[PDB]
Homo-oligomer: A and B are copies of this chain.
Amino acid sequence: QIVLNCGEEPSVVANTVKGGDGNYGYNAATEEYGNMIDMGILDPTKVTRSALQYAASVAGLMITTECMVTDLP
A interface list, Cβ under 8 A from B: 9, 11-12, 15
Contact = CB atoms under 8 A, between A and B. Distances in A.
6 contacts: A9-B11, A9-B15, A11-B11, A11-B12, A11-B15, A12-B15
Interface of A is mostly: helix
Number of copies: 4
Nearest to A7: B64
Contacts of A11: 9, 11-12, 15
Q: Chain B CB within 10 Å — which of A9, A12, A15 has the most? A: A12
Contacts of A15: 9, 11-12
Contacts of A12: 11, 15
